[PDB]
């Protein structure tokens, strides 16, 4: 617990509020972070072997991310459960609107946000491509890019989030392998399905799936196809079908993310420019 990058926030400064989400590998909770001047701040808390010092170093590296389309880590708190075991807790800024996937579903209800215009849908994709272009430059592999892991800020801009399964290219990954094997198969590139080996081209494939999720307003990828058939399905050349009212140009941008050879897929900088140009060409 040396903490050379000063990422740890004193546990006494944090009071855990209500639970927002609960999964097999942890939970998201509301919280108040008592700032130095006595003012409490609204934050979200992510709760959960390998030496915890490595977790803090990765957290410290993400704390240095400065891009409006990438969530910013505030710090880490350590909790001692049952019989003296250090359990880290990621402190994130509180984001009212929640995840993009749920938001898209809510928009199809009379009570939710109004019908999302095509230009707003295309702007969500540009925001994700900008965040992914920034992470891609820093040699970061997200490895879990999906609309459910993109957060909506209060000003309605999207940011890429959920870096629990991330890895810097060339860095160690042994203690993440168990969690990687349980990842949803419908977002995984054809070459990564075989042994769960990822490249930046695996994130490009998942970005195309994320674009299709936004264009269909929250549909689960591949209707009619079960998870156990996914590898065979892609092996036969089949891909996500064109969503209704999706511009043929937009669908071509998504289809380029799913080319069999990872080297044939474009980069996030190319995708980002194509989406910004497509967005400019509309009323
Ligand atoms: C119903 N509702 C829910 C909400 N709000 C939320 N719900 C979900 C989330 C997701 C948790 N996220 C996230 O980034 N986790 C994450 C990031 C980094 C690391 C990590 C791991 C190792 C090393 C370094 C870093 C681990 C996990 C986003 N955030 C919020 C929010 N921020 O307000 C509002 N309404
Ligand atoms: Cl489909
Ligand atoms: Cl089609």
Swiss-Prot record:
What does the UniProt record tell us about how this protein is modified after translation? Autophosphorylated on Tyr-170, Tyr-174 and Tyr-175 in the activation loop allowing full activity.
The Swiss-Prot or TrEMBL record describes its family as follows:
Belongs to the protein kinase superfamily. Tyr protein kinase family. AXL/UFO subfamily.
Put simply, this protein is called: Tyrosine-protein kinase Mer
Q: Which residue intervals define the domain Protein kinase in the entry?
A: 14-279
Disease with which this protein is associated in UniProt: Retinitis pigmentosa 38: A retinal dystrophy belonging to the group of pigmentary retinopathies. Retinitis pigmentosa is characterized by retinal pigment deposits visible on fundus examination and primary loss of rod photoreceptor cells followed by secondary loss of cone photoreceptors. Patients typically have night vision blindness and loss of midperipheral visual field. As their condition progresses, they lose their far peripheral visual field and eventually central vision as well.
- Give binding positions for ATP: 20-28, 42
Q: In which tissues is it expressed?
A: Not expressed in normal B- and T-lymphocytes but is expressed in numerous neoplastic B- and T-cell lines. Highly expressed in testis, ovary, prostate, lung, and kidney, with lower expression in spleen, small intestine, colon, and liver.
The range of the complete sequence contained here reads: 578 to 862 of 999
What organism is the protein native to?
Homo sapiens (Human)
Q: What does this protein do?
A: Receptor tyrosine kinase that transduces signals from the extracellular matrix into the cytoplasm by binding to several ligands including LGALS3, TUB, TULP1 or GAS6. Regulates many physiological processes including cell survival, migration, differentiation, and phagocytosis of apoptotic cells (efferocytosis). Ligand binding at the cell surface induces autophosphorylation of MERTK on its intracellular domain that provides docking sites for downstream signaling molecules. Following activation by ligand, interacts with GRB2 or PLCG2 and induces phosphorylation of MAPK1, MAPK2, FAK/PTK2 or RAC1.
Assembly notes: Interacts (upon activation) with TNK2; stimulates TNK2 autophosphorylation. Interacts (via N-terminus) with extracellular ligands LGALS3, TUB, TULP1 and GAS6. Interacts with VAV1 in a phosphotyrosine-independent manner. Interacts with TIMD4; this interaction enhances TIMD4-mediated efferocytosis.
Tell me the impact of changing residue 129 to S.
In a head & Neck squamous cell carcinoma sample; somatic mutation
Q: Where in the cell is it found?
A: Cell membrane
Residues that the record marks as modified (Phosphotyrosine) are 170, 174-175
Q: Which residues form the active site?
A: 144 (proton acceptor)
